[PDB]
């Protein structure tokens, strides 16, 4: 046995391309449109729950992911690739910020992290890219919000308002025009619901849906009180009913 | 053909052909026999030499005061197999206090060239041995192939031209398995047996090895004026 | 320490008392010797606290592994478990043990496993620091093939001696019974087992 | 032979109304012999102050230390380090070296730069925070230091006011140890300027 | 197409050939069988004479592990050498940590799991070797066959080798004709005449009959091999029933 | 080994350094050498256990003359130092620590001023107008902090290096067998062949 | 075996060329455009954004200009996500550095180091090299101001002006022309982003498609300031050199 | 074309090793199907013996994984029994550790994960095998978790797999279309394996004797399989209305 | 150091005094040793201070990964099984003396830990140098079926017994109440009963008191523009 594939399966081509890195992009065009608007007070991420199956329990599978109590992940392309890089993520969080400085660490360092892994799959021996492009929201002290996208390559961008995988081409027109500096939370996710209902077939309700904000510190979802510093996450996950009602002001 | 790049690839039909190529390479060695009584064992081994000049390379390797054995084929090959042959025997003895029983040396050495067949980056060993010894069982003639196979047997004979000396002592089984207490007399069986794969040389004082044990004889070679009398 | 097992008619039952100590503090007074690394496989723990919870997590461990392979285990079996780690780690680990089990096959079996890691398969078996003060009367008064009352008791008389020579050992008599008809626990306080 | 008392020395840290000072003496030895009068025992990486007692060459191996981490801090986050996650940084680092420590007692100071809040702490060899309201101390004469700073201080005394209890905390102090004294500072620190002041004091 | 090239690769139809072709090298080999009886088992084995020079009885086939499992292969034979080997060392270790002998399915899952190991890299060849083996443990009598691809199920009777399809359709009779069940002692003479039977397929050259057995009551649960009378009085058994 | 002395004055380095080696009995030599050349304007010399201070000192030279030729160019006196200054605070927890304390002299050509600095086996730096190891400066100090101004010729520190040798001489029960002094300046590094 | 799909990143072909190195200056010559100018008082680094979006965030955007340490920067072409791993190792030996001399790295060393190890990458470990050029704008003690670049190869030079990425033929050739040595940054910063102005590919030369930075000693007396230019100072300095 | 043969990306951003994984999954010919009551979780599978010479009672493709999880396999036996050998190993290993019993979910996210590195590492061939988990949950209740060679993994209020999934999963949908509940509502675990086979012999129309099933059922605190007598007075009732 | 830990009704509560010491010197007079491990569990410490605050972090934070990876709410007995395995493997070189408890899908728990990996199950628990103190009052006013006001009081006595009569422990009394459904409320300095008193005299002193050498402004600026 022993890994004997030490050498690179990523390499350049004659005209300057590397194959698999652009391969791996295909994957994530194929993949689900996820999307991603950021407000004054908030950050918006979402994206469909396409279900494999109607005997299939759709709410086991997560498309969304907290990463730390601050920033949130969402993904296109391969589902088992997300999850991997999600538990490598948080984890990375830990060993390589908080137990060293004791606080999470800020938006653009973990997606700095995040992007070193995928970039990693892209150079080491005997393994090929990551075949997903993600989404990543989040909040910290002195730089405000903020969005990120990470592409299997490595590299990684901030935006305004973003949108990745099946029809991006079209919502990021749609974007364009609906965007500015002035809009609130609340905006934000109306512009995304209107965004997202263009790129969904069938059903478009809370079930099909899956939508997290960063926004306001929530004491309620702290676990404890006593700590007037701690005033909890500002990762939320809306509900299938929040979800719902405004799809009613739609 | 598309399947013989390497050692971890079977053929369509199920075939090792690295292992078979190997195979060949002792076919192309010098002619070697072996052959024994119920007191004795004897090695017999044509050697070859490069030109005139050039001296006639050694066939015959002792492993130990009961055992040895006969190559044919690439000679570094046998040097390594001897040599881990020389170690196993002498484990026995040091941990033990037990000569190694020529039975299970043909299980060590079996073993040691399966490794090299089932695994990607090496190469089977190519190289033939016939092992003769005297242990608590009595006398023992082995023939091992590089394939991983090894038998155990009255007489045999490996390498080029090898079939005319396997049929002679084919024929004369019952005769030369009674040659007991008469060591001379085996020795002249195995001569007459190599002596039918000869063609256009002869043997001479310089071309022809031997080697013997037996119940009250440790394992020992004869060359030079120590074969004329055989001659 | 005061711990034993004595196996009997319908199986084997398993007694301790509730005593850990740091030097002369009564750490825990009402602490649980009697640990369970299989369904009816428990055992008896003596020596460093550390080691004998570190071992027992193990033995439970590699029986629940077993078990998902090769189905239940024999008491010996689990025995060996803990020899293995005892031998291999006598220099670092200060453990006296007693392993007792239940099978349908074998009925109840108790092996004692000592300081040294060696094992000793017993009729009965008694350990700990209290043990040395009756060795004469549970030899006097152990008999094969008891009945579960005859047993209880046998058990109760001893700890109760063994508690009350030894100041290491005290609180509650612990006992688990093992048999066919399952597992059942038994505790004895103060005020009943001092008048004995 | 004890690491921690062969070179000798003390740091004192103490908060104010908007303000905080630490100060430090310049003594270095070896045991009972005098061999540097410019040993200075507070550094700074951006606006936070580390003040670190013990092991000279620890001290000096520290302060590179966090000279190293500080500046890539800077490079990867995009702003100078603040005193509350500093002090996390130090901890981490002294005790990844639990069994084999840094034979040292820093003190950080500073005032976070986005709150206004005077901030100052301290640790023991192998990372342990405390993190008082009123006054940190360390070094060979940590004791006199605690006698001195537990009649002297008061809260919220101005800039001016607090120089002046932490100068005659030290000094006090310093003149009541053998390895400690040759000279001393005092930092003043606000939120955007720092005072440095020498004091005399006597060289025995 | 070059799906067969490499082990461990999936073909289009989810096929690793790597393993296929290993099954050819095994249905080259000689015939070899197994007999489950009333309280043990049987292992026979076809051993081709190329030469009169072979010394009769000498070169031993079937092979002991621990000692209550017998094994016995066809195909390539250093390859079932080296799977014996590691059997020996899983036995030895399963001994060593839980005392009892290693349980005879214990036993085929830890062959059957090296064996499928070696068709998850393309850095190694798959067995050349289909394995009859099994004995007697505390549930009773155990028999297995394990493949090329780590595929093993139990048997009441099995054959392997070129051979194969006369071997089974004779031991299909025996289980229909013994739904109670077959002695150990009628388990010996049935694989005697099975090995007769099957070696039509190899009629060039002649042959000699090997035979072993485990059995509660005839070895006390160890794996023996039959010799001397046991052993003529199957061979006349056989050469009655060829005629 | 035992006396290391070391002064900076206005435009030089002066180090001194014992001649005596000792093998508990006998004195096996009276004219030894305690310093190495680490480049044209820094000089290190060295005192500490048998067989690890030349060991040491021969391997921080190599280090510096691989510098020096790699990038052309001579390190500044306080780069050396602190260099040898972490490779003795590595040394300090090691499995077999580097007994050695050394002094080094340099002449900065940027600055164009002397520097001395003081480093001992721990890794315990100090840049001094003067400086000692062991017990040499016990003796030596008060008569330095007594003459020494910063304003001193090569000439007046040699001299004030006289008083403190004879107070050496008179004092210590050990027999060092005098020194050997070297200077380091703006021109290299020469010996004091009578002293 | 594994042997099979092996595409052997290090060798020679026939001519003695290194095929993967040869093929990742290929993928360089398509990223956008940077340029380095070293004048008497300072350098300038100039660099063009690839084709970006209204909605892309600016103010809180980097991928060509980057900070080493005070004295030094790099203008990168080429793989943004390779070109991190570099910087960061880069990052780590300046600080190695500082912490064994207890002075900043000089310039030349730095490069050295970084350039040693792309070079590693075409020898040995069978792994494909890293796509990306660098500008090295840097101030030491010893040389002063200095630029550098280095390639996939390993290979460095210096320079007195340079450009990477897409279009350096041309590029080269006007700062050829127009290249002084007397030379003051403020004429320098002209150079560049008029050098700019005329390689793009882009139909005008904007604030929100460039990156900008300066390293000068107009840093109050004997010091070096880093200047990376904000989004509306770079709108300023495009409407004072007269190109909006 | 070695994107094939290995785990590497296609031109269209596939990967094809794990689709022909996908398709050695279906080599058995073999049928499963998994379904919730209120107290209990389901799983039947069809049983082939098609030798006369093989000991029936060794030929099974479900597994006690512990105490409280079971799984079925849809593949080939060899690969089975490599990932059974490893579920068992890493829910013993979780109760070591963490000091509570592995949850259903969790085993199967872990057996997922692993999935993904042979999808990702070149070394490793993908297992040709689809892993259904089954379990009582002490937190979430009865619950089902399917996992593939993509590295997929996902719950279910029922399921089924083989090459006659798409009948059984049709046949399941309906059901649960009038009752618009998750589950069975049942009492009793007897007839909610009653449910599984009948809804079975519908989907696929076929009719079935004691050994041609092979049931599994897991309750609060126990996985176990039923026996051929115990599957035989499952199918008496049965027929018996 | 003096910590407790008492079960009640529907929950448990720990508490701790905020005296921590070098020898016989008080380096903090107001410490914190109750712990957080998650949101509804938390420890209380004695022994080496830096380890008991390394492992509750290092254990809360894999907790927390834990927590994620699983998609539950932490349990106590994980956070114990993972404490004790990691003290064991380091023989008691890691110093740490814990009572762990908190609340969690399976119910309420209170669990002690010793330094070398021996751990223990009860209904109330004392831990440090003022541990017998505490110890005392808790074998005289428990009882089973304590309503959370009742097990507040009871665990505040037993930290105030430590307090007053171990030299190890004084300050203020810190409490944790972690009930069944309800978030954990962390009441630090529930009880201040040892506030100094005024002193007799000011020691402000007047300006230019202490002599001076040298004035400097320090430059913590970084270099700046132009
Ligand atoms: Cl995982
Ligand atoms: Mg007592
Ligand atoms: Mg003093
Ligand atoms: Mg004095
Ligand atoms: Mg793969």
Not at chain 1, 24 to 38: C, Y
Not at chain 2, 26 to 41: D, E, P
Not at chain 5, 69 to 74: A, K, L, Q, R, T
Not at chain 6, 104 to 120: A, C, M, R, S, T
Request: proline share 3%; aromatic share 8%.
């Amino acid at each position: 046995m022993t890994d004997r594939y030490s050498f690179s399966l990523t390499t350049f081509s004659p005209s300057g391309k590397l194959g698999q890195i652009d391969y791996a992009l295909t994957a994530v065009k194929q993949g689900v449109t996820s999307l991603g608007i950021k407000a004054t007070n908030g950050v918006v991420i979402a994206t469909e729950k396409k279900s494999s199956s109607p005997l299939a329990m759709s709410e086991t599978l997560s498309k969304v992911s907290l990463l730390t109590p601050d920033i949130g992940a969402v993904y296109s392309g391969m589902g088992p690739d997300y999850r991997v890089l999600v538990d490598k993520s948080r984890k990375v969080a830990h060993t390589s910020y908080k137990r060293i400085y004791g606080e999470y660490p800020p938006t653009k360092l973990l997606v700095s992290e995040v992007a070193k892994i995928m970039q990693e799959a892209t150079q080491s021996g005997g393994v090929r890219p990551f075949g997903v492009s993600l989404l990543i929201a989040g909040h910290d002290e002195f730089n405000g919000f903020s969005l990120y996208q990470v592409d299997p390559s490595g590299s990684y961008f901030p935006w305004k308002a973003t949108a990745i995988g099946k029809g991006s081409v079209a919502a990021k027109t749609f974007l364009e025009k609906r965007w500015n500096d002035e809009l609130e939370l609340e905006d934000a996710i109306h512009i995304a619901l209107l965004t997202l209902k263009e790129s969904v077939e069938g059903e478009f309700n809370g079930d099909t849906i899956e939508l997290a904000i960063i926004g306001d510190e929530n004491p309620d979802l702290l676990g404890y009180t006593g700590i007037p510093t701690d005033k909890g996450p500002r990762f939320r996950k809306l509900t299938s009913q929040e979800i719902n009602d405004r799809l009613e002001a739609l | 053909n598309n399947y013989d790049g390497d050692t971890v690839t079977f053929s369509p039909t199920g075939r090792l052909f690295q292992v078979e190529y190997a195979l060949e390479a002792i076919k192309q060695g010098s002619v070697t026999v072996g052959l024994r009584s119920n007191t004795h064992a004897v090695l017999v081994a044509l050697k070859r030499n490069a030109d005139e000049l050039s001296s006639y390379q050694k066939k015959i390797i002792k492993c130990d005061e009961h055992m040895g054995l006969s190559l044919a084929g690439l000679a570094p090959d046998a040097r390594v197999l001897s040599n881990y042959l020389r170690q196993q025997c002498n484990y026995s003895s040091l941990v033990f206090n037990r000569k190694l029983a020529v039975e299970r040396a043909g299980h060590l050495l079996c073993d040691k060239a399966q490794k090299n067949t089932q695994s990607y980056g090496g190469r089977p060993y190519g190289v033939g041995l016939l092992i003769i010894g005297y242990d608590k069982s009595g006398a023992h003639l082995l023939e091992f192939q590089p394939s991983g196979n090894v038998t155990e047997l009255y007489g045999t004979a490996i390498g080029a031209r090898s079939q005319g000396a396997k049929t002679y002592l084919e024929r004369t089984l019952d005769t030369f398995i009674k040659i007991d207490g008469n060591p001379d007399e085996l020795i002249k069986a195995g001569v007459e047996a190599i002596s039918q794969s000869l063609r256009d040389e002869s043997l001479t004082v310089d071309n022809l090895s031997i080697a013997i044990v037996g119940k009250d004889t440790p394992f020992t070679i004869y060359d030079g004026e120590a074969v004329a009398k055989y001659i | 320490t005061s711990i034993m097992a004595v196996t009997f008619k319908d199986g084997v039952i398993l007694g301790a008392d509730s005593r850990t100590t740091t030097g002369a503090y009564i750490a825990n007074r009402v602490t649980d010797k009697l640990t369970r690394v299989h369904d009816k496989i428990w055992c008896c723990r003596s020596g460093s606290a550390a080691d004998t919870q570190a071992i027992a997590d193990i033995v439970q461990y590699h029986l629940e592994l077993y078990t998902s392979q090769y189905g239940t285990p024999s008491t010996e079996t689990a025995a060996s478990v803990f020899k293995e780690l005892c031998y291999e780690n006598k220099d670092n680990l200060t453990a006296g043990i007693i392993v007792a089990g239940y099978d349908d096959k074998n009925k109840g079996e108790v092996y004692t496993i000592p300081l040294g890691g060696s094992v000793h398969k017993l009729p009965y078996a008694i350990a700990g620091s209290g043990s040395t003060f009756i060795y004469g009367y549970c030899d006097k008064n152990f008999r094969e093939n008891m009945s579960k009352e005859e047993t209880v008791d046998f058990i109760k008389h001893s700890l109760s001696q063994a508690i009350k020579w030894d100041g290491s050992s005290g609180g509650v008599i612990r006992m688990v019974v093992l048999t066919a008809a399952g597992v059942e626990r038994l505790i004895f306080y103060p005020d009943e087992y001092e008048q004995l | 032979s004890d690491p921690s008392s062969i070179n000798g020395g003390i740091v004192v840290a103490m908060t104010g109304k908007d303000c905080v000072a630490i100060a430090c003496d310049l003594r270095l030895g070896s045991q009972s012999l005098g061999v540097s009068n410019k040993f200075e025992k507070i550094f700074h990486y951006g606006h936070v102050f580390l003040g670190i007692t013990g092991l000279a060459t620890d001290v000096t191996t520290l302060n590179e230390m966090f000279r190293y981490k500080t500046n890539l801090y800077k490079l990867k986050e995009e702003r100078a380090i603040e005193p509350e996650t500093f002090t996390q940084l130090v901890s981490s680092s002294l005790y990844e070296r639990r069994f084999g420590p840094y034979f040292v007692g820093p003190v950080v100071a500073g005032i976070n730069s986005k709150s206004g809040k005077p901030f100052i702490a301290g640790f023991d060899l192998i990372g342990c925070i405390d993190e008082a309201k009123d006054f940190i101390v360390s070094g060979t004469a940590s004791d006199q230091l605690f006698g001195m700073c537990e009649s002297l201080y008061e809260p919220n005394l101005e800039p001016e006011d607090l120089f002046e209890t932490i100068s005659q905390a030290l000094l006090n102090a310093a003149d009541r140890d053998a390895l400690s004294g040759w000279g001393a500072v005092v930092y003043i620190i606000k939120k955007d300027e720092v005072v440095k002041r020498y004091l005399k004091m006597r060289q025995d | 197409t070059g799906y067969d090239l490499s082990n461990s690769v999936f073909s289009p139809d989810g096929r690793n050939f790597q393993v296929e072709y290993a099954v050819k090298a095994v249905e080259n080999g000689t015939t070899s069988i197994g007999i489950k009886c009333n309280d043990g088992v049987v292992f026979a084995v076809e051993k081709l004479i190329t030469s009169k020079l072979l010394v009769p009885q000498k070169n031993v086939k079937i092979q002991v592990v621990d000692r209550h499992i017998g094994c016995v292969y066809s195909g390539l034979i250093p390859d079932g050498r080296h799977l014996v080997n590691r059997g020996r060392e899983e036995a030895a270790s399963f001994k060593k940590l839980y005392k009892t002998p290693i349980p005879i399915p214990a036993f085929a899952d830890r062959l059957g799991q090296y064996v499928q190991a070696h068709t998850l890299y393309n850095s190694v060849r798959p067995f050349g070797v289909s394995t009859i083996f099994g004995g007697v443990d505390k549930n009773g009598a155990h028999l297995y066959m394990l493949e090329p691809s780590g595929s093993y199920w139990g048997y009441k009777g099995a054959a392997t080798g070129k051979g194969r399809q006369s071997a089974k359709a004779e031991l299909e009779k025996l289980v229909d004709h013994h739904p109670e069940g077959l002695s150990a002692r009628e388990a010996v003479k049935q694989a005697a005449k099975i090995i007769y039977l099957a070696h039509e397929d190899n009629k060039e050259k002649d042959f000699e009959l090997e035979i072993s057995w485990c059995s509660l009551s005839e070895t006390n649960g160890l794996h023996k091999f039959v010799k001397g009378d046991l052993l003529q009085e199957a061979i006349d058994f056989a050469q009655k029933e060829i005629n | 080994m035992d006396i290391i002395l070391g002064i900076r004055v206005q435009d030089s380095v002066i180090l001194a350094s014992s001649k005596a080696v000792t093998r508990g009995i006998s004195v096996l030599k009276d004219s030894d050498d305690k310093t190495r050349q680490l480049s044209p304007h820094t000089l290190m010399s060295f005192a500490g256990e048998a067989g690890d201070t030349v060991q040491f000192a021969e391997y921080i030279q190599a280090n510096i003359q691989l510098y020096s030729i790699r990038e052309d160019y001579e390190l500044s006196p306080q780069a050396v130092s602190s260099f040898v200054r972490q490779e003795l605070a590595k040394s300090i927890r090691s499995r077999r620590p580097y007994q050695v304390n050394v002094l080094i002299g340099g002449y900065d050509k940027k600055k164009n001023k002397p520097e001395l600095y003081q480093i001992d086996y721990l890794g315990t730096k100090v840049e001094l107008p003067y400086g000692a190891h062991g017990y040499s400066g016990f003796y030596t100090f008060s008569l330095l902090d007594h003459h020494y101004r910063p304003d001193m010729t090569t000439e007046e520190g040699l001299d004030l290096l006289k008083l403190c040798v004879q107070e050496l001489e008179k004092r210590m029960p050990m027999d060092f067998k005098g020194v050997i002094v070297k200077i380091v300046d703006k021109d290299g590094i020469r010996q004091v062949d009578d002293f | 075996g594994s042997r099979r799909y092996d595409s052997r990143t290090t060798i020679f072909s026939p001519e003695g060329r290194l095929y993967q190195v040869e093929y990742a200056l290929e993928s360089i010559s398509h990223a956008g455009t940077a340029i380095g100018i070293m004048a008497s008082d300072g350098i300038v680094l100039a660099a063009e954004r690839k084709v970006t979006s209204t909605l892309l965030e600016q103010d809180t955007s980097t991928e060509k200009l980057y900070k080493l340490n005070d004295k030094i920067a790099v203008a990168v072409a080429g793989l943004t996500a390779d070109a991190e791993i570099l910087i960061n190792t880069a990052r780590i030996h300046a600080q190695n550095y500082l912490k064994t001399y207890n002075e900043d790295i000089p310039v030349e060393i730095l490069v050295r180091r970084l350039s040693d190890i792309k070079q590693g990458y075409t020898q040995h470990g069978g792994l494909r090299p890293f796509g990306v050029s660098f500008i090295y704008a840097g101030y030491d003690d010893r040389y002063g101001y200095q630029l550098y670049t280095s390639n996939p190869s390993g290979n460095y030079t210096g320079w007195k002006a340079i450009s990477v990425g897409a279009n350096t033929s041309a590029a080269q050739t006007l700062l050829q022309m127009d290249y002084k040595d007397d030379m003051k940054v403020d004429d320098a910063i002209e150079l560049a982003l008029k050098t700019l102005s005329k390689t793009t590919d882009s139909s005008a030369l904007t604030y929100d498609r460039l990156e900008f930075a300066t390293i000068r000693k107009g840093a109050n007396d004997g010091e070096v300031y880093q200047k990376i230019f904000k989004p509306q100072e770079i709108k300023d300095i495009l409407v004072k050199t007269g190109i909006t | 074309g070695y994107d094939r043969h290995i785990t590497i990306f296609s031109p269209e951003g596939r990967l094809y090793q794990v689709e022909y994984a996908f398709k050695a999954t279906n080599q058995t010919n073999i049928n499963s199907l998994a379904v919730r009551g209120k107290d209990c979780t389901v799983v039947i599978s069809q049983k082939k013996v098609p030798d006369k010479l093989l000991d029936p009672t060794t030929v099974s493709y479900i597994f006690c994984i512990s105490r409280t999880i079971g799984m079925v396999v849809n593949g080939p036996i060899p690969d089975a029994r490599n990932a059974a050998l490893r579920a068992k190993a890493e829910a013993a290993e979780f109760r070591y550790k963490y000091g509570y019993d592995m949850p259903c979910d969790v085993l199967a996210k872990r057996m997922a994960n692993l999935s993904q590195i042979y999808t990702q590492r070149a070394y490793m061939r993908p297992l040709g095998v689809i892993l259904t988990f089954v379990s009582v949950d002490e937190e979430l209740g009865p619950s089902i978790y399917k996992t593939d060679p993509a590295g997929y993994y996902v719950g279910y209020k029922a399921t089924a797999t083989g090459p006659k999934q798409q009948e059984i999963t049709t046949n399941l949908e309906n059901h649960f279309k009038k009752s618009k509940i998750d589950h069975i509502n049942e009492e009793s675990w007897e007839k909610v394996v009653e449910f599984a086979i009948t809804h079975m012999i519908d989907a696929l129309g076929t009719e079935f004797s004691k050994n041609d099933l092979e049931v599994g059922v897991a309750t609060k605190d126990k996985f176990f399989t039923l026996s051929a007598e115990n599957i035989e007075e499952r199918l008496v009732a049965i027929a018996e209305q | 150091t003096t910590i407790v830990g008492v079960k009640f009704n529907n929950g448990v509560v720990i508490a701790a005094d905020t005296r921590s010491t070098q020898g016989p010197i008080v380096a903090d007079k107001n410490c914190a040793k109750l712990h957080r491990i998650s949101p509804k569990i938390w420890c209380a410490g004695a022994g080496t201070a830096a380890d008991t605050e390394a492992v509750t972090q290092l254990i809360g934070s894999n907790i927390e990964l834990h927590s994620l990876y699983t998609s539950r709410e932490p349990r106590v007995v994980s956070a114990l099984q993972m404490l004790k395995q990691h003290l064991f493997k380091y023989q008691g070189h890691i110093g740490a003396y814990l009572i762990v408890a908190g609340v969690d899908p399976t119910g309420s728990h209170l669990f002690s830990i010793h330094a070398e990996g021996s751990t223990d199950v009860g209904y109330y628990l004392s831990l440090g140098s003022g541990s017998l103190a505490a110890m005392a009052v808790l074998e005289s006013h428990w009882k089973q079926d304590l309503t959370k006001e009742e097990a507040i009081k009871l665990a505040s006595d037993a930290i105030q017994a430590g307090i007053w009569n171990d030299l190890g422990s004084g300050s203020n009394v810190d409490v944790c109440v972690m009930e069944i459904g309800k978030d954990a409320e962390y009441l630090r300095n529930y009880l201040t009963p040892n506030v100094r008193e005024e002193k007799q005299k000011s020691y402000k002193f007047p300006r230019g008191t202490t002599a001076v050498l040298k004035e400097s402004i320090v430059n913590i600026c970084d270099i700046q523009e132009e």
